[PDB]
Amino acid sequence: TTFLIKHKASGKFLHPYGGSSNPANNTKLVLHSDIHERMYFQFDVVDERWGYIKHVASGKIVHPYGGQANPPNETNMVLHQDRHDRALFAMDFFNDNIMHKGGKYIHPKGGSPNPPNNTETVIHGDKHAAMEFIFVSPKNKDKRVLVYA
Template sequence: MKTMTLNFLIKHRSSGKFFHPTGGGPHPENGTKIVLHQDIHEHMHWTFEKVTGHWGYIKHVSSGKIIHPEHGSLNPGNGTKLVLHSDRHWAALFALDSANDYVIHKGGRYAHPVGGSPNPSKGTTVVLHSGVHDAMRFQFVSTSDRNEEVLVYGNPTMVGKWKMLYMVLNPIAEHVEQLQMKIGKSATESVTGSFKYKWERSGGLEIGIVKASASESFKAMFEKTASATWSSETTRTSEIRVIPGKSVVTWQFVFDVQQGESRSVFQSDLFEDTDSETKEPEALQYKR
């Protein structure tokens, strides 16, 4: 998986054909239809300009024109053709949903090959329709490798920190504490937005995408985690033996991944004890 915020191709997943302006020229006229074609050249490159949230313009790189529903309606009907036009307005906003392989218009309909065939012929017009099926899925791929998906919205951001789980200071008697530890995607701190990014999946995340954007120290922490860190939240019980006069503070390393409205907090299986609530563990110290 490659992160790319500049040029990409829009590929019909089932047929392998691509979005093109009709005629394939570098400067198509306003109203030029978007069709599917197997050829690859620089005049069918696209880029995405974010406008608000996950909505933005799909721009034809060589002409600077953007994709519109024909006649520019905010709520176009089924079968409305997609065309290029130089105007920029609310009705030209789209979202590129790489988690589900959808091209979504702001009005709620999706890009389809007209007729809905899984293997449309060369020159098939791309239209908007409310139906959802395998033949209306599109992928966003590198201009140099048609099989390599790109991250149109860029990498998510990730931070990590040690979080205090338990503390007993200067105990006067020896005893055993039962500690409840939550591991995995936090059910209370994680927020799923209205739009799903490529790295998000049910109960966890695509580790390769997030790891690719992490610092070297975070990558090292990734390598030390078990799969339970990146799955749905579970609870484990652990015993801690407390010794008289010896303070014990138990810490857990937590990863926080965010993009747009989405936030996923992953409580890792990496734990460390220190002897003070003001002394966090060193970054790469850990134990299972």
């Protein structure tokens, strides 16, 4: 299933910075209001809840920058071609968040619930309204879709 990753508080979406169909390794993931095919994602299940968040246009996947098992708070989120266990996430569509395998979550950098376009995303352990995400149809940004298959 292809989906948009929608920041719940702002309605902005997860994007590769610059909107490339082929972002370079370590391109930052940002929040931006635009909708286009280069911000579509899919989820590739690896182990039950855990899997890779794949940028459809390029096939690169979401990573914490540097590929640590337990990235510290404020580590940037990026795209990278590599597949390994430090690129595992769970798409928690019940609590509305995205959790890295090390137990922290994807956040807007600095915690704003209404961040401007091109705000970077980071890892952070906190849970609050401004780190919530929902996973929606490319054809209807208000319609949740099931990312697991």
